[PDB]
Design an enzyme around this catalytic site. Structure first.
Site, mmCIF file in Angstrom:
data_model
loop_
_atom_site.group_PDB
_atom_site.id
_atom_site.type_symbol
_atom_site.label_atom_id
_atom_site.label_comp_id
_atom_site.label_asym_id
_atom_site.label_seq_id
_atom_site.Cartn_x
_atom_site.Cartn_y
_atom_site.Cartn_z
ATOM 1 N N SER A 198 0.848 -1.186 0.000
ATOM 2 C CA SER A 198 0.000 0.000 0.000
ATOM 3 C C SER A 198 0.885 1.238 0.000
ATOM 4 C CB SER A 198 -0.896 0.036 1.242
ATOM 5 O OG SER A 198 -1.766 -1.077 1.273
ATOM 6 N N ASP B 285 -9.035 -2.554 2.956
ATOM 7 C CA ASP B 285 -7.801 -2.924 2.300
ATOM 8 C C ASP B 285 -7.101 -3.883 3.248
ATOM 9 O OD1 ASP B 285 -5.966 -2.649 0.055
ATOM 10 O OD2 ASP B 285 -4.595 -1.715 1.496
HETATM 11 C C1 LIG Z 1 -3.410 -5.447 -1.961
HETATM 12 C C2 LIG Z 1 -2.282 -5.838 -1.001
HETATM 13 C C3 LIG Z 1 -1.552 -4.831 -0.263
HETATM 14 C C4 LIG Z 1 -0.464 -5.155 0.675
HETATM 15 N N1 LIG Z 1 0.165 -4.061 1.342
HETATM 16 C C5 LIG Z 1 1.200 -4.370 2.246
HETATM 17 C C6 LIG Z 1 1.868 -3.244 2.958
HETATM 18 O O1 LIG Z 1 1.618 -2.054 2.839
HETATM 19 N N2 LIG Z 1 2.895 -3.635 3.866
HETATM 20 C C7 LIG Z 1 3.333 -4.953 4.147
HETATM 21 O O2 LIG Z 1 4.213 -5.236 4.944
HETATM 22 N N3 LIG Z 1 2.705 -5.958 3.461
HETATM 23 C C8 LIG Z 1 1.675 -5.721 2.538
HETATM 24 N N4 LIG Z 1 1.008 -6.866 1.806
HETATM 25 C C9 LIG Z 1 1.556 -8.218 2.112
HETATM 26 C C10 LIG Z 1 2.643 -8.177 0.900
HETATM 27 O O3 LIG Z 1 2.071 -8.287 -0.446
HETATM 28 C C11 LIG Z 1 3.713 -9.346 1.051
HETATM 29 O O4 LIG Z 1 2.960 -10.557 1.049
HETATM 30 C C12 LIG Z 1 4.539 -9.445 2.358
HETATM 31 O O5 LIG Z 1 5.308 -8.263 2.385
HETATM 32 C C13 LIG Z 1 5.544 -10.624 2.370
HETATM 33 O O6 LIG Z 1 6.102 -10.910 1.137
HETATM 34 P P1 LIG Z 1 7.431 -11.721 1.022
HETATM 35 O O7 LIG Z 1 7.706 -11.863 -0.426
HETATM 36 O O8 LIG Z 1 8.522 -11.041 1.794
HETATM 37 O O9 LIG Z 1 6.985 -13.042 1.680
HETATM 38 P P2 LIG Z 1 6.767 -14.450 1.020
HETATM 39 O O10 LIG Z 1 8.066 -15.054 0.707
HETATM 40 O O11 LIG Z 1 5.820 -14.323 -0.063
HETATM 41 O O12 LIG Z 1 6.050 -15.244 2.217
HETATM 42 C C14 LIG Z 1 4.756 -14.921 2.767
HETATM 43 C C15 LIG Z 1 4.047 -16.203 3.159
HETATM 44 O O13 LIG Z 1 4.781 -16.841 4.203
HETATM 45 C C16 LIG Z 1 3.866 -17.459 5.116
HETATM 46 N N5 LIG Z 1 4.226 -16.984 6.491
HETATM 47 C C17 LIG Z 1 4.607 -15.760 7.019
HETATM 48 N N6 LIG Z 1 4.877 -15.649 8.359
HETATM 49 C C18 LIG Z 1 4.633 -16.983 8.714
HETATM 50 C C19 LIG Z 1 4.696 -17.693 9.965
HETATM 51 N N7 LIG Z 1 5.038 -17.100 11.096
HETATM 52 N N8 LIG Z 1 4.386 -19.068 10.004
HETATM 53 C C20 LIG Z 1 4.017 -19.764 8.857
HETATM 54 N N9 LIG Z 1 3.919 -19.204 7.612
HETATM 55 C C21 LIG Z 1 4.240 -17.799 7.592
HETATM 56 C C22 LIG Z 1 2.451 -17.187 4.654
HETATM 57 O O14 LIG Z 1 1.830 -18.312 4.015
HETATM 58 C C23 LIG Z 1 2.640 -16.002 3.738
HETATM 59 O O15 LIG Z 1 1.654 -15.950 2.713
HETATM 60 C C24 LIG Z 1 -0.109 -6.602 0.848
HETATM 61 C C25 LIG Z 1 -0.836 -7.626 0.110
HETATM 62 C C26 LIG Z 1 -1.873 -7.314 -0.771
HETATM 63 C C27 LIG Z 1 -2.564 -8.510 -1.479
#
Ligand SMILES: Cc1cc2nc3c(=O)[nH]c(=O)nc-3n(C[C@H](O)[C@H](O)[C@H](O)COP(=O)(O)OP(=O)(O)OC[C@H]3O[C@@H](n4cnc5c(N)ncnc54)[C@H](O)[C@@H]3O)c2cc1C
Ligand SMILES: Cc1cc2nc3c(=O)[nH]c(=O)nc-3n(C[C@H](O)[C@H](O)[C@H](O)COP(=O)(O)O)c2cc1C
Length: 609
Positions: free
Chosen positions: A392, A606
């Site tokens: 966001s 959101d």
């Molecule tokens: C419309 C929209 C807006 C968003 N805005 C924001 C924002 O402003 N700020 C923000 O920080 N994020 C936001 N998100 C979440 C963001 O998109 C990312 O998913 C998040 O930052 C993590 O991505 P990553 O690639 O680092 O993690 P990834 O490698 O994709 O891993 C995330 C996944 O790990 C798993 N996971 C996480 N913690 C644990 C746990 N403790 N135990 C078990 N499984 C776990 C879950 O299944 C999760 O889906 C938003 C999502 C959407 C759909």
């Protein structure tokens, strides 16, 4: 030829499958359905509606025995995926006569959400209203149960119904086994090798607008600082320089970024498979007639594919485990893999627990089953495409037209698999240090999380932790409007945290806004400190009288943002209670009242999960 219809004619396609996908589930289904066409002697192609003009559906009847299929995922509040936004907007405006158009729809959704498969249902009913002909019932996939089998179940009835409609039948020829063949390149110019770009070759170095999902703009990271005081978590604030990109955005919109997997994890996978990751190659479709020439941008090295194009962190799909089983030299291991890939109840049970809930990834499966030695090229066509991550935007284009701010918590945890998992994008963003320059491939996706049309309309913002992100933009903008001499209604923020000394984000900024009168009220709650836990819904309840006035008399708009769906639920329930007490009215009536606010555009959400 920029018309999907003309594009079809060129390659003799009679079936086109559009995907409304944000995390690739719908896209893969569309790929599978497109490929299916061939089993019936027909030819299809899958397609991203964002790259076309769906009004061209009007010309589809020019192609004999043509069919258009839609695999559409539903997102926040029934909204379409980012890539289907233009198609959605167009559908609502148009009144075009689609007589002669044949269609079928498969919706991807989740029953636990209020607007179950809203997008699928909308596209299906809308096409009929426009005069198109439905060839098969709308499919309603439910990710709360088992989306894959829903898809399989629909698919198995879909094809016979389509084959019948068009007069054909299954060919029953070779199954194929693999979809691509390996072609190595001993010698090849560096100029012909993809290095991580998503669309056109060298599009990352030769930055040319307009920029979008297929042509991301590489924004320079101008700031990347730690927001929280603690050490147990890492909350960060970043600012991406979008100067000269012509990219436009507004408070409430989302910015998507294409991350890079951890280099060390990539190395490990290459090592465990005993392969040279620096080998340049191409994976070409065995079937020369397929429109899907390659699984991802080629030619490219194995390293580049694993780093920029493939998902190597999420739980491997059951079909991936099924395919991998044939490469396990140890019977017990081969058998374990099949049991996990099977549809039996024990099988499903094991997969859910040991693979999904334990968050094991492709590398973990490879270490856990040492007799498992698949050729790296075959593994790459089995892996899913790496997806963009959405955030966001925490800034107002009225104040920062050339910079997009992000607020995010770094993801890192000890999975039940016994290993430590790292969020892909947040780990990559965290390492982006300002000044060569740290660049972030990104594009903007519009949302409907907008400030009121009229500045005088009151604004109520509810969000815990990082959910405050879009609101920093809102407050920045409202403050700006006041400076501009405009009449701005009240601006209230109900923010939740754990500790004021652990993670009280943007303290200085909020205090300044409040002191200036831009932020009418600043209500903060801390949930982790003594058994007495205060949350945002409590803050709202303590302010029931004033909120009811702003809502019932002031016409205020409500906004809720955060990573927890239960948080939104509790907030919503709190508003039901306030309406019930001050109407006054029965609970059931209060519920209708609040939901009406939502349909009337005065209650926006959101929620990120
Ligand atoms: C419309 C929209 C807006 C968003 N805005 C924001 C924002 O402003 N700020 C923000 O920080 N994020 C936001 N998100 C979440 C963001 O998109 C990312 O998913 C998040 O930052 C993590 O991505 P990553 O690639 O680092 O993690 P990834 O490698 O994709 O891993 C995330 C996944 O790990 C798993 N996971 C996480 N913690 C644990 C746990 N403790 N135990 C078990 N499984 C776990 C879950 O299944 C999760 O889906 C938003 C999502 C959407 C759909
Ligand atoms: C933030 C978010 C919001 C969602 N909102 C809805 C919704 O309102 N209704 C619904 O039926 N499914 C909803 N879903 C479920 C998705 O539609 C389902 O998981 C779909 O499979 C995702 O497909 P994709 O990978 O092709 O985007 C939501 C998923 C996420 C992650």
């Amino acid at each position: 030829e920029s018309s999907f219809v003309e594009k079809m004619k060129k390659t003799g396609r009679n079936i086109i499958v559009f995907y409304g996908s944000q995390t690739g589930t719908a896209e893969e289904f569309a790929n599978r359905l497109s490929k299916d066409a061939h089993r019936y002697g027909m030819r299809g192609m899958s397609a991203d509606p964002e790259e076309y003009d769906l009004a061209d559906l009007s010309s589809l009847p020019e192609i004999d025995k043509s069919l258009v299929v839609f695999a559409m995922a539903t997102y926040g509040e029934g909204d379409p995926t980012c890539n289907a936004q233009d198609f959605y907007d167009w559908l609502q405006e148009t009144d075009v006569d689609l007589t002669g158009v044949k269609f079928a729809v498969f919706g991807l959704g989740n029953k636990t959400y209020e607007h179950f498969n809203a997008m699928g249902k909308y596209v299906d009913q809308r096409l009929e209203q426009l005069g198109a002909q439905r060839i098969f019932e709308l499919g309603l996939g439910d990710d709360d149960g088992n989306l894959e089998e829903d898809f399989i179940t629909w698919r198995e009835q879909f094809w016979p119904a389509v084959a019948e409609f068009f007069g054909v039948e299954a060919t029953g020829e070779e199954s194929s086994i693999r979809q691509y063949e390996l072609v190595v390149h001993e010698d090849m110019d560096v100029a012909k090798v993809y290095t991580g770009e998503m669309g056109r070759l060298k599009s990352y170095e030769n930055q040319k607008p307009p920029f979008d999902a297929k042509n991301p703009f590489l924004a320079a990271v101008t700031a990347n600082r730690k927001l929280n005081q603690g050490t147990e978590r890492h909350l960060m604030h970043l600012e991406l320089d979008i100067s000269d990109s012509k990219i436009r955005y507004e408070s409430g919109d989302h910015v998507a970024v294409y991350p890079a997997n951890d280099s060390a994890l990539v190395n490990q996978i290459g090592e465990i498979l005993g392969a040279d990751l620096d080998v340049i190659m191409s994976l070409n479709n065995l079937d020369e007639e397929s429109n899907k020439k390659h699984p991802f941008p080629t030619p490219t090295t194995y390293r580049t594919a694993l780093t920029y194009y493939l998902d190597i962190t999420n739980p491997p799909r059951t079909n991936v485990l099924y395919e991998l089983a044939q490469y396990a030299s140890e019977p017990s291991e081969q058998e374990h893999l099949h049991k996990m890939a099977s549809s039996s109840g024990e099988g499903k049970e094991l997969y859910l627990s040991w693979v999904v809930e334990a968050r094991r990834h492709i590398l973990a499966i490879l270490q856990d089953y040492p007799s498992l030695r698949p050729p790296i090229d075959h593994l790459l066509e089995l892996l899913p495409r790496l997806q963009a991550r959405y955030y966001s935007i925490a800034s107002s284009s009225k104040v920062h037209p050339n910079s997009v701010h992000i607020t995010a918590v770094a993801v890192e945890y000890e999975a039940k698999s016994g290993r430590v998992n790292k969020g892909v994008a947040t780990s990559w963003l965290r390492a982006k240090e300002p000044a060569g320059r740290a660049l972030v491939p990104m594009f903007v996706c519009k949302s409907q999380f907008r400030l009121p049309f009229k500045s005088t309309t009151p604004v109520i913002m509810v969000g815990p932790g990082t959910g405050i992100a879009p609101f920093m933009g809102f407050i920045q903008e409202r403050a700006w409007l006041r400076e501009q001499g405009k009449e701005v209604g009240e601006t209230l923020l109900y923010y939740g945290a754990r500790r004021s000394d652990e993670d009280y984000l943007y303290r200085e900024e909020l205090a300044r806004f409040h002191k200036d009168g831009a932020l009418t009220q600043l209500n903060v709650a801390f949930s982790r400190e003594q058994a007495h836990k205060v949350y945002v819904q409590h803050l709202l309840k303590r302010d029931r009288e004033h909120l009811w006035k702003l809502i019932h008399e002031g016409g205020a708009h409500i906004y809720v943002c955060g990573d927890a769906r239960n948080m939104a639920k509790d907030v919503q329930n709190t508003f039901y209670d306030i309406v019930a007490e001050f109407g006054p009215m029965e609970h059931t009536q209060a519920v209708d009242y609040v939901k009406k606010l939502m349909t009337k555009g005065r209650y926006s959400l959101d929620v990120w999960s």
